[PDB]
Amino acid sequence: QTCASRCPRPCNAGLCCSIYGYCGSGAAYCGAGNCRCQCRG
């Protein structure tokens, strides 16, 4: 709901922020274009 607001470190290590407005993993959340933050590492 406010991940982008807590960027570039909205969540902890291991998870990535999805443009949809939610953290997660894999490509769905940490994919090229489908990630708002935590895409580089």
Give an overview in words:
- The chain is α+β, with helices and mostly antiparallel strands.
- The protein has one domain (2-41): Endochitinase-like (Wheat Germ Agglutinin (Isolectin 2), domain 1).
- It has 1 helix and 2 strands; from the N terminus they run ββα.
- Strands 1-2 form a two-stranded antiparallel ribbon.
- Strand 1 (16-18) and strand 2 (22-24) form a beta hairpin.
- The PDB classes it as antifungal protein.
- Keywords: Antifungal peptide, Chitin-binding peptide, Disulfide stabilized motif, antifungal protein.
- The assembly is monomeric.
- The entry is titled "The Solution Structure of Antifungal Peptide Distinct With a Five-disulfide Motif from Eucommia ulmoides Oliver".
- The protein: Eucommia Antifungal peptide 2.
